[PDB]
Amino acid sequence: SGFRKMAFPSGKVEGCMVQVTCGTTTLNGLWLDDVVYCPRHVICTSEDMLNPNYEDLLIRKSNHNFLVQAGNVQLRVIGHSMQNCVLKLKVDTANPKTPKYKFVRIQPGQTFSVLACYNGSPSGVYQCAMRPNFTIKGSFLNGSCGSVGFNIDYDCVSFCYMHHMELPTGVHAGTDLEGNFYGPFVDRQTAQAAGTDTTITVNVLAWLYAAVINGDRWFLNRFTTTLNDFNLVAMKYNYEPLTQDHVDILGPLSAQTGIAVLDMCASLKELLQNGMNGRTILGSALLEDEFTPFDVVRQCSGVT
């Protein structure tokens, strides 16, 4: 029993973090096989950040300008290329700690673990979601860029995020491991406003299921509703619209708890309309939307 915002074990990723230094800019890189992946803005001065021409900046850089340190051992760079907003540094040594891995571009609402790093050294691990406005609500200081988000399926690490940006509102933007930004964000010091941060409705319902499973049931009511009725209420409260897909994904939690998805929707509807009245659900005073249905099954069934 008990339900916790749980990250994946970070060991497999700890073994991949290196320090990349280009002139006086240092940040984190990801060493997989004989490639080190890092934010292309490693080649920039903070001066450069205002309107950088990465193609032109990169012409001035050679393999030997890219200082890659793995713990205390320097890697030899035999190749460099820019893919979207990441650099790939070919090194002469395969990372002996390369786990089985994939690069996956995630959908908004999907959750992942971040290994926050500074100077290629891990400081901590926390769980995130890709917000519907393609920001993440991270914990990132200067030097944190190149820290990666990931999922683990048994022994395979799926890398989904590399950290690049803080927006002036203190939220986080970055890329998949192909260096394509989530959302409309660019690696440039400019006016970039986040859109509406909407609640991930399907994740809230998942977390309502997790609560019932762990004995928090005060919010279960006598009512039901319909997808269309529920969605009218969701619109009003800047909740994502709930689809039949979301209902299907909640099927197993529905089945295990014996509470129909649309009944749980009617519970959520009442919580939106009436608030929590100073009560709590799994030790939270607001509706948690950063557990997926997959996350709830996993944590409730002890998948390793």
Added chain:
Amino acid sequence: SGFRKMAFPSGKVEGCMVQVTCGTTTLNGLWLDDVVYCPRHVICTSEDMLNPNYEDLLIRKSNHNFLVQAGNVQLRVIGHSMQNCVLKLKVDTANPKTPKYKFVRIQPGQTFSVLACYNGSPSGVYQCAMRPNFTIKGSFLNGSCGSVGFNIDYDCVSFCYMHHMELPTGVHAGTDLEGNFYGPFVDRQTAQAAGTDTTITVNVLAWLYAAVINGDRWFLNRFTTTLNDFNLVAMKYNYEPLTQDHVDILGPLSAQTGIAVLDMCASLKELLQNGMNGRTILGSALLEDEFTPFDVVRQCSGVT
């Protein structure tokens, strides 16, 4: 910017988790040097849990009854002994992944990372506090016993918790790595009620400092108070009494933010008396008490 419930990287501990099986009971052990540490109730049947005589139960067990598997490789047990509520299994192989480590018994209010494990395999990592009633609010399923709580100071893992028990209220009890229970709990299937779960006042103030640093300041007020006045309000709300020690520990956060501890106390007092009025602080609708002042400094200064 951004503030997150952050665990330590779990890699150094992942390398220490093994599976211990005694007859038909399996749980997790901690392999450090040539010793595997595990809950002594590994020797019990669930029948046994009602009123176990561990000394008598253990007389019936030999080294070869303790099946220790490290990933997929069996360790040879050359010795076993009971220290308080843990077993120490001497194995013929030093764990090659033994990090620098210590066993430390923590104080209530102190925070640590849990690597939740099943069958000696990591499933996840989350941050905890030792509650003032010596419970932790964990996420633990059957087979999770032997999962450990820890802190990391640069390269040294201080093990502070081994998981043993769920109380009938779904909260968690366990031991330091000498096998002494935190609080009055025994490894026995019996009436064990937790005492008052009081709020860790000094941690809440630390988290109020973390909020100001990260731009959440709506709750900063025009008032101040005194240790004695504040404590009258703390009593009423089942907050731990605030000592001059707590004030001293908050000194650096005080200094960095330029908000005197007693002014922040007067802010906390108003929040207790008036609630949050539907507002949030670092994305939480209640007062978080599972960051220490040390945790806030660390996360705000990017210590690795």
